[PDB]
Amino acid sequence: AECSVDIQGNDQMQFNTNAITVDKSCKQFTVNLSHPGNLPKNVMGHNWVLSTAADMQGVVTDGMASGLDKDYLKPDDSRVIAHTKLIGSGEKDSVTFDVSKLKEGEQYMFFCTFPGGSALMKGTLTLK
Ligand SMILES: [Cu+2]
Ligand SMILES: [Cu+2]
């Protein structure tokens, strides 16, 4: 509440929300990601990744293609605004980023890059 948000990914490849609002009074924003499932990183990993809506597909494609040993992200990917590490059951990670990286009126998406086979894990992120 206010300048943070706690998000979960499960064994059903779902995030517990598909929408994040960042208040513009915030100097920083923090995402606390957790995994209440039972399965490990290699089979059911989740990360939290931020990019503009235009860049999401590119990030996911090159990320899925980068493999487990890179946490499913293209190394040196400038399109990534912020991200957590890849987590499995019972693990957690948090990322804090400067609200200055976002611009009001601009369209952003948060998403996971783990190749699950099910429908892409994503949601909207808005600066207001
Ligand atoms: Cu995921
Ligand atoms: Cu990175």
Q: What ligand is nearest to the CA atom of residue 122? A: 1
CA–centroid distance, 104 to ligand 1, in Å, is 27
Q: What ligand is nearest to the CA atom of residue 83? A: 2
Tally of CB atoms within 10 A around 103: 11
Q: Which two tokens stand for residue 87?
A: 């987590």
What residues does each domain of the chain span?
A: 1-128
After which residues, if any, is the chain broken (C to N > 2.5 Å)? none
Q: What ligand is nearest to the CA atom of residue 81? A: 2
- The 3-state DSSP class for residue 1 equals coil
Structure obtained using: X-ray
Fold (topology level) of 1-128: Immunoglobulin-like (2.60.40)
CA–centroid distance, 16 to ligand 1, in Å, is 11
Q: What ligand is nearest to the CA atom of residue 10? A: 1
Q: Is 25 exposed, middle or buried (0-12, 13-18, 19+ CB in 10 A)?
A: exposed
Q: CA–CA separation, 37 vs 20, rounded Å?
A: 22
* Secondary structure percentages of the chain, helix, strand, coil, to 5: 15, 35, 50
Q: CA–CA separation, 64 vs 120, rounded Å?
A: 11
CA–centroid distance, 17 to ligand 2, in Å, is 23
